């Protein structure tokens, strides 16, 4: 349709995050997750904040024919109850943090 | 952006049941702080701007995973609704169509009063107590919600509000929430406001019965 | 006649409509149902044998509680529950004994045993309740059921569903079956008959080896698989089919 | 019989109550007209029931180091015995092992 | 049979083909395994290697 | 759950529901101051005397008896009265005895149409040869679905004549498929 | 009785006694068939209907009444039965308005001066000001004091300037999109072609809460009344079904109304972008049938139902509840990339083996300089096929692997290092076993990262559960996971006593019996008659071996 | 039968930071009512005889909270709250607590800002906790084969209403009551000033250090 997937699925993105925002969030203390070329299905049970450090991911929501693309330097918030498929085609590295209600 | 609406009465008009100092902090500090915080958030998102107030509350509620703007947007509506739920020389009993709907949906006004009181006494922590009009069921109900939640997020039409956040009664009653509830039902609740809110709600619910031809 | 469920209504001697529904198996087995004068449903297996619906249903593992809930007229079903019947229905094993008493018409109280079920299964359920693929299709479409096409055997709901329509048939909901319609018939060609003879011939060969296997064991001799198998069960089964079966005819 | 798919309508002269409580049969005390309003059939269409709603407009039709063990699966580079159909049922042997420690060349009987 | 009169023997011809092509297996697979009283000796048929030999005459 | 899963982005008809029917062209067919203009008058504001965030604006016969407060009887009006509040809070009326409103696009006053104090009717059923006028083609059977200024859209329907004692198989609005009794 | 059933038909099934305009033949059929079959007609209605079977008699009857033929033709299309009580619309005080720019200005993707926009947006705080009816008299401006130049409309004029600039730059594009998306015109669509007139208001000119004067243009029995409010889209008042039986007496085509905008929506997704209610006349008491949701289009690009329902406000597609709590499930640690690492591990090991066996092939070439064979398609790394094993045929999958994605420099050093230890063990009369290699260690560290990710989600989930249970917030997505009996009264339940067929023993021809006998033969061809001495799990039969070794 | 213990200081000893009027209502009415109502819900039930910590875990019921949980958890929370403050509090901690704080928050100044912000943003009634996270999960495959010893860390967590970190098997070390009754008689709506006063004048770091030793010993006993 005309509406972008990010708007439809409430996927907040903050492309080209400044270092100030990273330190406000305390990203340097976040856990690390990495992968190579693979395919990860996931249903988010809580919100997750992801800061991509290397590579890129294409996110295909359940039943979708389009994808959302996030690149290194982007800060992504995956919402609770989102069901999607994550696709990687090259080395990928991220720092993540899961957020409960309130929190951040 | 939203302005801070003044209550429909002077700040000392609810004395001695609700003190002037309570109104000054409750409206002048709490309600004002909610409006100011919401306006900052709306100035950064053009999409949340442009929603109506009811639409914004439903949209930011996000079907049970509320967005950061929900608490401010819900609270500004809740407090605006609350000041209009009260009037000087309020209390006693409703009349005309409000009384008949209450007697139909609760059995009697006495039954409604206990249901409203028990909901207000058993709401743990901060929250609100509502007399609502059910859209699908076409009847009145007593509902209690926690923190900033209001019946708009479930497409219900509020009729009467009571704030049971501690900041609304602690200066005048301290821990005696039951006295605060009893005073609200006896001297403050505006049944005149409920008449107009029921009239506005009847543009969407139709609590009447159809005229069916014998043909 | 094709396997399936057929809803008839015959007039009695007094001109009162009585509605009957019959289940036909892939073997021609008929499990007839009926509505009597007192509205008591009977499973007529023969002209002299009658079985109540509740006894038959409970012997198949359906408890009394679900039957009432899933029928459109539970008050009708409860109205015929005698005190004696209720105690037997309460257990699956006792219902089987009650079913055997009515089905066999033998005076006495049978004792539950594995051999009794095996004898009962072949005489009744192997002959009468094996719908097959054609019967399952006809049962499903006629009774409006979403049951997978792979289930070739009768289910308790299929029997229960037949009871429901029978009542609703008496009260003007639906239409009676036409037995002479070709959609209720089926054609058995040379493939069906030659396959029956092969199946009949393979049942004989199994017992031919069973007799020969015992003989070799009684003599402590090693039997060659050949000596255990003789050709006559397959040769003579087909010469006898072609010579004696009324559907095998000398070509004009 | 109905000449076309559609919904039933009557205005007057049909009893609103059914002939019997369970049934959908209505009597006519007077002469009347029964109307069949034409409409297309859903047929074998799915109908989602969460997005298809009243008055919607449809513009579209309806050696161990080489092996691996994972969730409900494993890979193997002990002789493997697979059934003829390639299908295992519950409690199925797929690999046996002949330990040389129990191998014998002399005859006898076994006691345990 | 869609644009000509079918062969008058077609029903017999297709039926016999179905018996050879599918009918044999359905019956040869219903043959039970034969075991004795003592279960010492067991006889079975390997149906997947069933064969039909052309007539000698 | 999605995580337990054991295509690569890198490589007509209108629904009628109450039971579904499709309405389309196969069963519906057509039978063939400044000057006042329609448009917005502005945004109605809350009147504090009536307690409602969104103004009531009007009552009907039933709601005026149920929900009208005693102190508001003096404010019930039979005709419309128009007031304008500017951005500084000043109240304007121009003529407080007529119906004058401001056009928000042209920014001028104009009169309302009224002061607010056809042959074929919607939903009627037609027979197959009913005459609406001598100079007009005969109508077709069906129900009037849409009424416009100079045309009507008909949903095709077929009547069946039934005599007393006949039995109808189906409740009202029951879907009947082709060939059903 | 025949009073509740009639009421039930009206309320539940939408019955109404709609007028049937009959021909003389149809009128005669209903009046005469009530008397008998072949009998002298006696009732004055049937006798008159018999006479009316001749149009010549009708013309004589019409002339005697002094009316024209066309008037008689119009009298048959008259509403029969009683009339509803006539409307009495009372005004709840005066109509007081402001000129407030729409909150949603400007449209998405249109750039305006943000300084002018903030000046425009100041007017939105004016809604908070209180107005009392006892106060609209003290300083009322009338006559010469109420001319337009006297009013402060500066913030609305800046909106008008921005609105006109947007209209001139987007008018043609919007009309082109209407033709591309909407094949035929319909009320609620964009007015285009010859019917378009310059000066029609675009959608961003409207906002909920605005009061409009308009005319009724279209009545739809299943949709409602469509009102022209001066725009390029007609407004829509939702009325449907039985309500029109009485409402048709009051809402007529061409009449002037006062309406209020209740909702404004995107015309690409919603059929009727402007939703209205009648202010004058007030018909709130006559409307009983409500739309659950505003109707939408299902368009060419709408292939995902979950995306469609998010574009509107519609609930998710319901599912059967799993019956298991997500916070009680075991953690996930199988990293999806491990399956790829395993493929690379096997590719390196078999390349190393060939290097040992046939080193003459690997002369003068560094293993890091190896290239794939001519024909290597990177897009065909997975080839599906089938293979025959003896008589059994199992499908076989081919996993193509590149040589340039392998680290053969590190593998060779590891391979040579382990060969030396194997040789040293052999020289001592001892055996050597390799416990794991670098790639196996690489698989565990990817698993550890995945396990940590699952642990952190579960820990946050446990806190999230306690917060939501305390504040009465949903644990599952609302609308998802409907309970039982929602999906139908009849469902095949193999476990249920109403769908079981082995009551009197498992059938010998049943699929269960055939499968059970099949694996008995498969096992017996391996084991036979031996007694089960003692059984142990594989996992507990590995530790004990490690302990003994 | 649980008993309402008095605070470990005279009711006038927190002046002027926390008035006697606040303590008269917070302890004498709110906390007293929680204990009184809890004793009515336990008498004659199986909750008799267990410690308050056991009652809180049992009544939580894995999220489907039983009627006694609100009284039981609040009674525990307030007893913990009174021990978290002293008449001469504030300042800085030392010892192993200061080492752990700097390890997990960078510096003490960084921790104070993060703790104050969490207490300020806690919407509605609730509590803000400094906890020692050494939890174990009751699910499968939830044990780390190779612990890193940095997994037992300090965290700042917010809870609503009566919830406390005990229900997730955390070890609370410090709390501040952000229910409005805790500060409304002294600061009215000014919750920021109340939080700042708590961290500068009231917090008892020696008690927090003492609670950390028991939490560390709790984890040590589990690991052996
Ligand atoms: Fe408040
Ligand atoms: Fe407290």
CSV table of C-alpha atoms in Angstrom, one decimal, chain B residues 1-3 5-8 39 42 46-47 49-52 61 63-65 84 146-147 149 200 202-206 208-215, chain G residues 6-7 10-11 15 17 103-104 106 108 114 118 121 124-125 128 130 132 207-208 245-246 260 277 284-288 290 468 471-474 477-478:
chain,number,residue,atom,x,y,z
B,1,UNK,CA,-1.4,22.3,21.2
B,2,UNK,CA,-3.9,22.5,24.0
B,3,UNK,CA,-4.7,25.3,26.4
B,5,UNK,CA,-9.0,25.2,30.5
B,6,UNK,CA,-10.2,26.9,33.7
B,7,UNK,CA,-12.7,25.0,35.8
B,8,UNK,CA,-16.3,26.2,35.3
B,39,UNK,CA,2.4,20.5,24.3
B,42,UNK,CA,3.0,17.6,20.2
B,46,UNK,CA,3.3,16.4,13.2
B,47,UNK,CA,1.3,13.2,13.0
B,49,UNK,CA,-0.5,16.8,16.1
B,50,UNK,CA,-3.7,16.9,14.0
B,51,UNK,CA,-5.4,14.1,15.8
B,52,UNK,CA,-8.4,15.2,17.7
B,61,UNK,CA,-3.0,4.0,23.9
B,63,UNK,CA,-4.1,-1.1,21.9
B,64,UNK,CA,-2.5,-1.8,25.3
B,65,UNK,CA,1.2,-0.8,24.6
B,84,UNK,CA,-16.9,19.6,34.8
B,146,UNK,CA,-5.6,2.8,37.0
B,147,UNK,CA,-3.2,5.7,36.4
B,149,UNK,CA,-6.5,5.1,31.6
B,200,UNK,CA,-24.2,14.3,23.5
B,202,UNK,CA,-27.3,10.0,22.4
B,203,UNK,CA,-26.0,11.2,19.0
B,204,UNK,CA,-24.1,7.9,18.9
B,205,UNK,CA,-25.8,5.3,21.1
B,206,UNK,CA,-29.7,5.7,20.9
B,208,UNK,CA,-34.4,4.6,23.0
B,209,UNK,CA,-36.6,1.9,21.4
B,210,UNK,CA,-37.7,1.8,17.7
B,211,UNK,CA,-41.2,2.5,16.5
B,212,UNK,CA,-42.3,-0.7,14.8
B,213,UNK,CA,-45.3,-0.7,12.5
B,214,UNK,CA,-48.0,-3.2,13.0
B,215,UNK,CA,-48.3,-3.7,9.3
G,6,UNK,CA,-42.5,-9.0,14.4
G,7,UNK,CA,-40.4,-6.8,16.7
G,10,UNK,CA,-37.4,-5.6,12.8
G,11,UNK,CA,-34.6,-5.4,15.3
G,15,UNK,CA,-37.5,-6.3,8.4
G,17,UNK,CA,-43.0,-3.3,5.5
G,103,UNK,CA,-5.0,20.8,13.4
G,104,UNK,CA,-3.7,18.5,10.7
G,106,UNK,CA,-0.1,20.8,6.5
G,108,UNK,CA,2.3,14.9,5.0
G,114,UNK,CA,7.7,26.5,10.2
G,118,UNK,CA,3.8,28.1,14.7
G,121,UNK,CA,-0.9,26.9,15.6
G,124,UNK,CA,-5.5,26.0,18.6
G,125,UNK,CA,-5.2,27.0,22.3
G,128,UNK,CA,-9.7,26.3,26.0
G,130,UNK,CA,-14.6,29.6,28.3
G,132,UNK,CA,-20.9,31.9,28.9
G,207,UNK,CA,-11.5,19.3,10.2
G,208,UNK,CA,-13.8,17.6,12.8
G,245,UNK,CA,-38.3,3.5,6.8
G,246,UNK,CA,-39.1,6.5,9.0
G,260,UNK,CA,-21.2,18.8,11.7
G,277,UNK,CA,-24.0,14.0,11.4
G,284,UNK,CA,-30.4,11.2,16.5
G,285,UNK,CA,-33.5,9.6,18.1
G,286,UNK,CA,-34.4,7.8,14.8
G,287,UNK,CA,-31.0,6.1,14.1
G,288,UNK,CA,-30.6,2.7,15.6
G,290,UNK,CA,-24.8,1.7,13.5
G,468,UNK,CA,0.8,-5.0,33.5
G,471,UNK,CA,-2.1,-1.7,36.3
G,472,UNK,CA,-4.7,-3.8,34.5
G,473,UNK,CA,-3.0,-3.7,31.1
G,474,UNK,CA,-3.4,-6.6,28.6
G,477,UNK,CA,-2.4,-8.4,22.0
G,478,UNK,CA,-6.1,-7.6,22.2
